[PDB]
Amino acid sequence: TVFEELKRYVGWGDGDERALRSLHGAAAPHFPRLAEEFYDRILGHEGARTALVGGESQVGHLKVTMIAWLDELLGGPWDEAYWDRRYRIGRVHVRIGLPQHYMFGAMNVHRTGLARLAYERFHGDPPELERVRNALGKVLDLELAVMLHTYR
Amino acid sequence: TVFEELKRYVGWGDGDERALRSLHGAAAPHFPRLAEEFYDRILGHEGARTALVGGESQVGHLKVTMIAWLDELLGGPWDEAYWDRRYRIGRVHVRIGLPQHYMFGAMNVHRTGLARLAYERFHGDPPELERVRNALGKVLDLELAVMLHTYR
Ligand code: HEM
Ligand code: HEM
Ligand SMILES: [C-]#N
Ligand SMILES: [C-]#N
Ligand SMILES: [Cl-]
């Protein structure tokens, strides 16, 4: 499978899983803010905003599901069940006809916010910041890999 | 096209371009190590390694073109001609039959190395680190977006 092959490629291990779970504790209180920044970016962008046409209640419901998505991202586990669920999430966006390039822009918003949260928490312990930064890069690149698999 | 719509989405500006140029000077002496790490990952991966059966000269030539790719990544400019060349690079990999998910694994190797060099150079100035780290995330995400466009 794509996730198994890529876990091997990127050197995914228990270290990455521990480091993400450490990040989860630091980041979870800020999930509402990360979701807010994510939708602010979609709604502020002329092309992306046209994908959201259910109004104020729609963004409210999407924030709830994105808080859950972030919780799973950093909490795991990152097993076949997890990745199977991520394929289904990719397919959702294929089916609504969302142009695939928006997935990269959107993931970059989370990448930027999560990287900042990692730095804020871990900068005083550089080797742990390195481990958390590295794990975060891997999980987000694997998420993209799996969600762009659904577009083919 | 995808670079222009996406550059607005991620907030690509002259600040990102200055940050990347500033990293270029610090990172460039380490490009050969980054390239070593990149090819060692391919050669150590059961699926990906089969793409490199052209011998020591193929790997040697690829290292040269990767050092150049990296120099362009951080030095720029990031103009129409740059992105047109990135499109052609993407198509090379489509033409040779490389599975698209390997592009994510391979980009992660560079992401991890480049993020480490950014920290090494800029950790004494946390606001500049933030700018450099943000710009690095954006350019790599844009690179993946363009590469994956060629696979469509
Ligand atoms: C990193 C990028 C993204 C992630 C992680 C993400 C995550 C999700 C999740 C978890 C769902 C719910 C799927 C379910 O029902 O189980 C969903 C649905 C949706 N997402 Fe996203 N999403 C992303 C990008 C985007 C973008 C860029 C847009 C629009 C600009 C978008 C618009 C939507 C819409 C409209 C739905 C609801 C679809 C429907 O059922 O009508 N998403 N997303
Ligand atoms: C971030 C990911 C990657 C980047 C930035 C990259 C970059 C490049 C560049 C700049 C070239 C030269 C293009 C040209 O001569 O016109 C190229 C060619 C090539 N790449 Fe990659 N590459 C990536 C991923 C991969 C992976 C994962 C593999 C194999 C596992 C691979 C195997 C090759 C091969 C075999 C060629 C030569 C094709 C030929 O014979 O003409 N590349 N790549
Ligand atoms: C999409 N939330
Ligand atoms: C391609 N190295
Ligand atoms: Cl950092």
Helix axes B55-75, B31-43, angle to 10 degrees: 130
Which CA distances in Å does A65 have to A49, A61, A136, B126? 18, 7, 20, 33
Method used to determine the 3D structure: X-ray
| Angstrom distance (rounded) from CA B27 to CA B34 | 10
Q: Which atom of ligand 3 is nearest to the CA of A63?
A: 2
* Residue A61 labeled ligand binder: no
| Angstrom distance (rounded) from CA B32 to CA A131 | 23
Answer whether A66 contacts ligand 3 (Cβ < 6 A). yes
In whole angstroms, how large is the CA radius of gyration of chain A?
15
Buried b / exposed e along B115-129 (16+ C-beta atoms within 10 A): bbbbbebbeeeeebb
Query: A77 vs chain B: nearest CA distance in angstroms?
Result: 20
| Angstrom distance (rounded) from CA A145 to CA B151 | 13
Write the burial class of residue B27 (CB in 10 Å: 0-12 exposed, 13-18 middle, 19+ buried): buried
Answer whether B59 contacts ligand 4 (Cβ < 6 A). no
How many CB atoms are closer than 10 A to CB A57? 8
Both tokens of A74, joined, read 């950093």
| Angstrom distance (rounded) from CA B93 to CA B16 | 28
Best to test chain B binding among A16, A83, A108, A129 (most B CBs inside 10 Å): A108
Please list the alpha-helical segments (H only) found in B44-125.
Answer: 55-75, 80-95, 101-122
Torsion of CA B11, B17, B22, B26, to 10 degrees: 90
| Angstrom distance (rounded) from CA A121 to CA A116 | 9
Tell me the one-letter amino acid at B12: W
Q: Are A71 and A128 in contact (CB under 8 A)?
A: no
| Angstrom distance (rounded) from CA B73 to CA B107 | 12
* Residue A9 labeled ligand binder: no
Is the Cα torsion angle A15, A150, B101, A37 positive or negative in sign?
Answer: negative
Q: Is B127 on the interface with A (CB under 8 A)?
A: no
Both tokens of A8, joined, read 């091997």
Peptide bond connecting B77 to the previous residue in cis, omega within 30 degrees of 0? yes
Query: A34 vs chain B: nearest CA distance in angstroms?
Result: 15
Nearest CA to ligand 3 atom 2: A62
| Angstrom distance (rounded) from CA B137 to CA B13 | 13
- Say how many Å lie between the CA of residue B145 and the centre of ligand 3: 18
Nearest CA to ligand 4 atom 1: B62
Range 26-65 of A in CB contact (< 8 A) with B: 41, 45-48
Write the burial class of residue A135 (CB in 10 Å: 0-12 exposed, 13-18 middle, 19+ buried): buried
Residue A152 Cα to chain centre, angstroms: 20
Q: Which of A88, A106, A73 has the alpha carbon at shortest distance from A147?
A: A88
Q: Is A101–B129 a contact, with Cβ atoms under 8 angstroms apart?
A: no
Residue with tokens 């990544």: B73
Chain B residues with CB under 8 Å of A138 CB are 108, 112
Q: What angle do CA A32, B135, A117 make, to 5 degrees?
A: 30
Nearest to A45 among B9, B108, B144 (CB): B9
| Angstrom distance (rounded) from CA B91 to CA B20 | 25
Q: Is A141–B111 a contact, with Cβ atoms under 8 angstroms apart?
A: yes
Residue A66 Cα to chain centre, angstroms: 9
Max intra-chain CA distance, chain B: 45
Q: Is A101–B6 a contact, with Cβ atoms under 8 angstroms apart?
A: yes
Chain A residues with CB under 8 Å of B2 CB are 101
| Angstrom distance (rounded) from CA B138 to CA A138 | 15
| Angstrom distance (rounded) from CA A98 to CA B28 | 38
Q: Is A102–B9 a contact, with Cβ atoms under 8 angstroms apart?
A: yes
Both tokens of B75, joined, read 């030095």
Resolution to one decimal, Å: 1.8
Q: Is A149–B101 a contact, with Cβ atoms under 8 angstroms apart?
A: yes
Which CA distances in Å does B93 have to B27, B90, B98? 26, 6, 6
Q: What angle do CA B78, B81, B84 make, to 5 degrees?
A: 100
| Angstrom distance (rounded) from CA A120 to CA A104 | 24
Q: Which of B42, B99, B94 has the alpha carbon at shortest distance from B66?
A: B42
